[PDB]
Amino acid sequence: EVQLVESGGGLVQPGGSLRLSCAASGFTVSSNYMSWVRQAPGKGLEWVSAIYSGDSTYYADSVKGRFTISRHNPKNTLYLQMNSLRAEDTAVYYCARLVGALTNIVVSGDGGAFDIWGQGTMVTVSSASTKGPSVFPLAPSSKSTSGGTAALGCLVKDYFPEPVTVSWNSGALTSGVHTFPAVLQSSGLYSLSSVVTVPSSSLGTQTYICNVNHKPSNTKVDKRVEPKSC
Amino acid sequence: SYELTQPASVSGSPGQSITISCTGTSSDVGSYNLVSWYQQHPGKAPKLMIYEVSKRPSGVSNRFSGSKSGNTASLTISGLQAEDEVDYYCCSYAGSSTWVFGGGTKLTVLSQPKAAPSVTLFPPSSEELQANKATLVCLISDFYPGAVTVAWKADSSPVKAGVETTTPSKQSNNKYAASSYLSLTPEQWKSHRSYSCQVTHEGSTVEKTVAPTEC
Amino acid sequence: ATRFASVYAWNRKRISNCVADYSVLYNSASFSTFKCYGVSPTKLNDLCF
């Protein structure tokens, strides 16, 4: 029940704004923790969002006049009206926790223990428009059938911008699923993969549905993965 | 924009002790204390293992520790296992309840069994040819140590135009991943005879040879 | 913490080998009745129980 859930994801264009949200469940945000860690894979990170309510002088000398945010305690949800979003802010944030000093966890000590996070949202600020992903069913081959374990999937290719989420059989296939991250093309396009190692006897008899979802473009494709039936 | 010095590449044998540091200045030597060390399997939110440097986390194996003096450091990671090949950071103060920390020490655990890279090569689908596109999907999984260079052989010809390979990403079984793509046209796909994807993993080579659709 | 026992089957807890305090009792919850028989609340940290 107690969980931080990110919501309010959509497409942002240069000159526009969007209202993000981190909703706590179980514990009310009136007397709880919220730390907005901004992560870019491979490099260092930064904690930026300075909103501890009461509205006094506490800010960081890097985002002056850019990140504006409000407080709503009783609703157990916080909204992030991140105005003037720059195109160089491609990162998935996480609202998290900390530890102070008051209660039984610390009677003598300092604190500072981020311990409960969210799952993040996928918001891309791109000058160009969003494009629907192209799903190409990668069919099993003769070697996969004769090898005992068949490899099949559906390549998501030439979609801009991110993201694309691939699920199998609407959650009815979990064993062997492995998702290969998107590639950065020279032209800026993306291509990811999702391969599940299935029994070779289930080819044709068991239907293989891959659900490809792209939220900013609002496209859902339920692609069928079929064997090579010439 | 604010970034402090850490030793990025650290490695140690299992059962040994390694030291992790993160740099500060003279405005941080008199009498403060705020240092909590991180732990990240790459690609997801961190994990807490060490905080309150010389005291007790609630539920944590007591094989890890920290030690504190002058300009002489330790996050003392001892009793190394196969699951310690993870990213690390610290925390620190910046004055008036402000904050800063270091640049991501990455630990690599040696003395692990080397596994051959499992390579699967997928030719483009029939409707992809109908879409006037061709993509050679090479997928390399379960390889360690992760030093792989994806090579393409279009009828024993090294082709580098249109080759895009991902960075090595950690997998579930203490190994890394790779997904390479060669983007060609259907005219160039059905002109050549065969297509082979090869990798050079610690000298070992695993090749997958596919052919265009017969019908 | 989460739940306590009844009065006829009174819940017993053993505490030793740690530091105790009374001023830390006014943070997690505000109490209603607090009577230390024979002992003043101000001196408790000054004796070693």
Q: Which helix (H) or strand (E) holds B186?
A: helix B186-189
**Which of C24, C30, C45 would best serve as a mutation to test chain A binding (most A beta carbons within 10 A)?**
C24
- Report d(CA B65, CA B17) in Å as an integer: 10
Going from the C-alpha of B127 to that of each of A26, A82, A154, B5, B123, the distances in angstroms are: 48, 42, 12, 51, 12
Cβ <8 Å between A107 and C21: yes
- Report d(CA B177, CA B168) in Å as an integer: 5
- Report d(CA A48, CA A36) in Å as an integer: 7
- Report d(CA B12, CA B110) in Å as an integer: 7
Residue A166 CB: number of other CB atoms within 10 A? 23
The label of the residue with tokens 């052989």 reads B153
Bridge-based pairing state of the strands A92-96 and A165-168:
unpaired
The answer to whether A153 touches A197, Cβ cutoff 8 Å, is no
Of the candidates C19, C21, C27, the beta carbon closest to that of A102 is on C27
A171 touches chain B (CB under 8 A): no
Going from the C-alpha of C8 to that of each of C2, C4, C5, C13, the distances in angstroms are: 19, 12, 9, 15
Cβ <8 Å between C28 and A103: yes
Q: Which helix (H) or strand (E) holds B127?
A: helix B126-130
Cβ <8 Å between B91 and A155: no
This entry's atomic model was obtained through cryo-EM
Tell me the one-letter amino acid at C13: K
**Phi, psi dihedral angles at A152 (to 5 degrees):** -145, 165
Can you read off the two tokens belonging to residue A195?
A: 């391969």
User: Which residue, A158, A155, A154, A156, is CA-closest to A130?
Assistant: A158
Beta bridge partners of B93: B99
Bridge-based pairing state of the strands B134-143 and B118-122:
antiparallel
A186 touches chain C (CB under 8 A): no
Give the CA diameter of chain B. Answer: 78
Positive or negative, the CA dihedral A44, A20, A157, B207 is positive
User: Which residue, B158, B34, B10, is CA-closest to A114?
Assistant: B34
Cβ <8 Å between A107 and C28: no
**Phi, psi dihedral angles at A170 (to 5 degrees):** 55, 40
- Report d(CA A22, CA B179) in Å as an integer: 33
The answer to whether A36 touches A95, Cβ cutoff 8 Å, is yes
The answer to whether A94 touches A37, Cβ cutoff 8 Å, is yes
Residue B102: DSSP 8-state: B
The answer to whether A53 touches A41, Cβ cutoff 8 Å, is no
The answer to whether B57 touches B36, Cβ cutoff 8 Å, is no
Cis peptide before B145 (omega within 30 of 0): yes
Q: B152: exposed, middle or buried (C-beta count within 10 Å: 0-12, 13-18, 19+)? A: buried
Measure CA B64 to chain center.
22
Tell me the one-letter amino acid at A173: L
- Report d(CA C45, CA C49) in Å as an integer: 9
**Phi, psi dihedral angles at C16 (to 5 degrees):** -165, 170
CA angle A163, A167, A168 (to 5 degrees): 155
Measure CA A130 to chain center.
17
Question: What 3-state class would DSSP assign to A212?
Answer: strand
Beta bridge partners of A124: none
Can you read off the two tokens belonging to residue A97?
A: 């926790």
- CA C41 to chain A, closest CA, distance in angstroms equals 18
Tell me the one-letter amino acid at B193: R
- Report d(CA A61, CA B165) in Å as an integer: 38
SS percent in chain A: helix, strand, coil, step 5: 5, 35, 55
Cβ-proximal residues to B21 (8 Å cutoff; 6+ apart), any chain: B6, B7, B73, B74, B75, B102, B105
Cis peptide before B212 (omega within 30 of 0): no
- Report d(CA B166, CA A181) in Å as an integer: 8
- CA A44 to chain B, closest CA, distance in angstroms equals 6
**Phi, psi dihedral angles at A108 (to 5 degrees):** -130, 120
- Report d(CA A226, CA A229) in Å as an integer: 8
User: Which residue, B181, B193, B123, B184, is CA-closest to B155?
Assistant: B193
Residue B189: DSSP 8-state: H
Chain A CB contacts of B53 below 8 Å: none
CA angle A138, A164, B210 (to 5 degrees): 20
C and A adjacent (3 or more CB pairs under 8 angstroms): yes
Residue B92 CB: number of other CB atoms within 10 A? 19
The answer to whether B23 touches B4, Cβ cutoff 8 Å, is yes
- Report d(CA B1, CA B103) in Å as an integer: 12
Cβ <8 Å between A195 and B120: yes
The label of the residue with tokens 């009577």 reads C35
Measure CA B208 to chain center.
24
Tell me the one-letter amino acid at A141: S
Cis peptide before A161 (omega within 30 of 0): yes
**Which of A138, A156, A225 would best serve as a mutation to test chain B binding (most B beta carbons within 10 A)?**
A138
* Rg, chain A, Cα only: 22
Q: C24: exposed, middle or buried (C-beta count within 10 Å: 0-12, 13-18, 19+)? A: middle
Cis peptide before A199 (omega within 30 of 0): no
Q: Give the strand order in the sheet containing A134-138.
A: A134-138, A149-159, A190-199, A177-184
Nearest chain A residue to C20 by CA distance is A107
Can you read off the two tokens belonging to residue C15?
A: 């505490």
- CA A59 to chain B, closest CA, distance in angstroms equals 10
- Report d(CA A143, CA A152) in Å as an integer: 12
- Report d(CA B22, CA B26) in Å as an integer: 14
Question: What 3-state class would DSSP assign to B168?
Answer: coil
Can you read off the two tokens belonging to residue C39?
A: 């002992």
Q: In chain A, positions 107-126, which contact chain C (CB-CB < 8 Å)?
A: 107-108
- CA A132 to chain B, closest CA, distance in angstroms equals 15
**Resolution (Å units):** 4.8
Residues of C with CB under 8 A from a CB of A: 19, 21, 24, 27-28
Nearest chain C residue to A104 by CA distance is C28
Q: B171: exposed, middle or buried (C-beta count within 10 Å: 0-12, 13-18, 19+)? A: middle
Bridge-based pairing state of the strands B105-109 and B9-12:
parallel
A94 touches chain B (CB under 8 A): yes
Chain C CB contacts of A105 below 8 Å: none
User: Which residue, B74, B86, B57, is CA-closest to B20?
Assistant: B74
Q: How many residues does chain B have?
A: 215
- Report d(CA A130, CA B43) in Å as an integer: 25
- Report d(CA B13, CA A227) in Å as an integer: 47
| Cα atoms found within 13 Å of the Cα of residue C22, Cβ hemisphere only | 12
- Report d(CA A189, CA A126) in Å as an integer: 13
Tell me the one-letter amino acid at B173: N
Chain C CB contacts of A108 below 8 Å: 19
User: Which residue, A197, A170, A166, is CA-closest to A181?
Assistant: A166
The answer to whether A18 touches A123, Cβ cutoff 8 Å, is yes
Bridge-based pairing state of the strands A165-168 and A208-214:
antiparallel
Nearest chain A residue to C21 by CA distance is A107
- Report d(CA A71, CA C37) in Å as an integer: 46
- Report d(CA C44, CA B107) in Å as an integer: 49
A31 touches chain C (CB under 8 A): no
Which pairs count as long-range contacts for C41-48, CB under 8 Å and 24+ apart, including other chains? C44/C20, C45/C20, C45/C21
Tell me the one-letter amino acid at B94: A
Residue A80 CB: number of other CB atoms within 10 A? 21
| Cα atoms found within 13 Å of the Cα of residue A184, Cβ hemisphere only | 2
Size of interface A-B (CB pairs under 8 A): 87
